[PDB]
Amino acid sequence: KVFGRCELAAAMKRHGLDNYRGYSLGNWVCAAKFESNFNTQATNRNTDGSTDYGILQINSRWWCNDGRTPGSRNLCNIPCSALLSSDITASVNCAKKIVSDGNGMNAWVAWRNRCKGTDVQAWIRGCRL
Numbered sequence: 001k002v003f004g005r006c007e008l009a010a011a012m013k014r015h016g017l018d019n020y021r022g023y024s025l026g027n028w029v030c031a032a033k034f035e036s037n038f039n040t041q042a043t044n045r046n047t048d049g050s051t052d053y054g055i056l057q058i059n060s061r062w063w064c065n066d067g068r069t070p071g072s073r074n075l076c077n078i079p080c081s082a083l084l085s086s087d088i089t090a091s092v093n094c095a096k097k098i099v100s101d102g103n104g105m106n107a108w109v110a111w112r113n114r115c116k117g118t119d120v121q122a123w124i125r126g127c128r129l
């Protein structure tokens with residue numbers, strides 16, 4: 001599914017991301033924008049052989065099982081395919097484990113390079129929440 005900006009904000013908020021580990025909603029929306037362009041079906045193969053999946057481009061080296069990432073972990077205990085669903089629940093729960101892991105939202109390179117320190121409030125501007 002390709003979410004609209006406010007639709008995704010509301011779904012993120014319903015699922016408990018707003019101010020989760022102190023990251024305001026706009027941070028999560030901005031991350032999703034630049035990681036997946038709001039498309040739940042996004043995948044992107046890395047040089048290292050792992051793959052990033054879903055609205056928040058969650059990576060198979062650590063977080064999910066795709067069956068083809070040699071030597072990897074599955075810390076969220078899910079198949080990577082679950083991060084592709086139009087229901088963002090699996091991506092939300094995993095992102096919660098990720099953001100709690102020690103580097104916060106710096107684990108999302110696209111957040112770090114395009115969202116961090118910007119006016120991320122703009123990403124929820126005009127949304128009923």
Ligand SMILES: [Cl-]
Nearest residue numbers: 057058059107
């Ligand atoms: Cl990740």
Ligand SMILES: [Pt+2]
Nearest residue numbers: 002003004007
């Ligand atoms: Pt829709």
Ligand SMILES: [Pt+2]
Nearest residue numbers: 011014088089
């Ligand atoms: Pt939902």
Ligand SMILES: [Pt+2]
Nearest residue numbers: 014015016089
């Ligand atoms: Pt939820």
Ligand SMILES: [Pt+2]
Nearest residue numbers: 033034037038
């Ligand atoms: Pt765009």
Ligand SMILES: [Pt+2]
Nearest residue numbers: 076093094097
């Ligand atoms: Pt969980």
Ligand SMILES: [Pt+2]
Nearest residue numbers: 013014128129
């Ligand atoms: Pt509200």
